[PDB]
Structure formats: structure tokens, C-alpha cells
Write a protein that binds this ligand. Structure first.
Ligand SMILES: [Zn+2]
Ligand SMILES: [Zn+2]
Ligand SMILES: [Zn+2]
Ligand SMILES: [Zn+2]
Lengths: 79, 72
DNA sequence: TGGAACCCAATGTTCT
DNA sequence: AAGAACATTGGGTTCC
């Protein structure tokens, strides 16, 4: 396809195992490598689009996980 | 306690009892015009920590708590 | 009390 | 591809 599977913006290729845009790529890396201690102000089902993806990092990080992102995807595609 | 984010207040600002962070947010919201979109259901929880998540919902309840720049 | 000017945390792009 | 590090935004406290 051509759209990020997390936020629907224009994907820039496959990162951490998932067709995503560049903003979701570095968001995930940051969330996964530090704490991801986020709280949703809604009911854990926020809509995450190009502009709203900024509102709710809890729900953004859940959609990254749901789309299959994982740090070791490179090492894992091998074998 | 902030009538908006229920943190605790520095005093009465723009017509309402609010925290300092809500003071500046409002001034900025009203002046800068931006158009904000809620990502939930137009009823987000607005508290000390979750404030920053939905400026649409934050700004809406500033308005509804009575905030207004001409409080003269 | 209202506002300026900080300062920092979080985002998204560049990297020639 | 991954990821440092740059640029910028939006935000809260300090100060005047
Ligand atoms: Zn994305
Ligand atoms: Zn959410
Ligand atoms: Zn407040
Ligand atoms: Zn909202």
C-alpha cells in the first residue's frame, strides 16, 4: 500500500516490521526504549490521524503494537 | 482547585478560578485562533496530567467555566 | 491579576 | 531499512 498502518499519513517504508510513516517510526522507538507511561483522557480508543496522533500517545502506542511493530523485526526477518 | 483541570489555582483569571497553566493555555487558545480536534467523544477527562492530551476539550471547558478575556 | 520571557518535554524532519 | 541529532511546537513555571 502507501499509508502508515498506525496513523494513515503517507508511509515512508517499512520500520520495525510495519509499513509506517517517519513520525510513527521514531515515536515507537522512543516509546519502546524508554517508559511508555501514558494515560488516555478518553476510553482507550482515540482516533489517531495525521494531526490527532499527537493527542494521545497511550492510544498511539497501542496502535503501533496492534499493527505489529517490534524493535527486533530486522534481526527477526532473518530466520 | 482549578475549575478546569482541577489542579490547584494561583487565583482568579479571565473570569474564573484557574491554575496558572490553564491561564496561559486559554490566553494562547483564544489569541492564536487554532482549530483543535478531539480524538475521542468531545468529553475527555481534563486533569493535571491529562490536560495536555486534548486541547479541544480543555478549551471547551475553559469557555464553559466562564473564561473570557474581557473580564473587566 | 495579566502578561513576557524563560525553559523543558515531546514531535517530526534532515542527514548535504 | 535504523537511528543521531537537528529544528520547531506547544506547553508550564518564574518573573516583572
Ligand atoms: Zn504514522
Ligand atoms: Zn486515547
Ligand atoms: Zn487547570
Ligand atoms: Zn477531547
Amino acid at each position: 500500500s502507501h499509508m502508515c498502518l498506525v496513523c494513515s499519513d503517507e508511509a515512508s517504508g517499512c520500520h520495525y516490521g510495519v509499513l509506517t510513516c517517519g513520525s510513527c517510526k521514531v515515536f515507537f522507538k522512543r516509546a519502546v526504549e524508554g517508559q511508555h507511561n501514558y494515560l488516555c483522557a478518553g476510553r482507550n480508543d482515540c482516533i489517531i490521524d495525521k494531526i490527532r496522533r499527537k493527542n494521545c500517545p497511550a492510544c498511539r502506542y497501542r496502535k503501533c503494537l496492534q499493527a505489529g511493530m517490534n524493535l527486533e523485526a530486522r534481526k527477526t526477518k532473518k530466520k
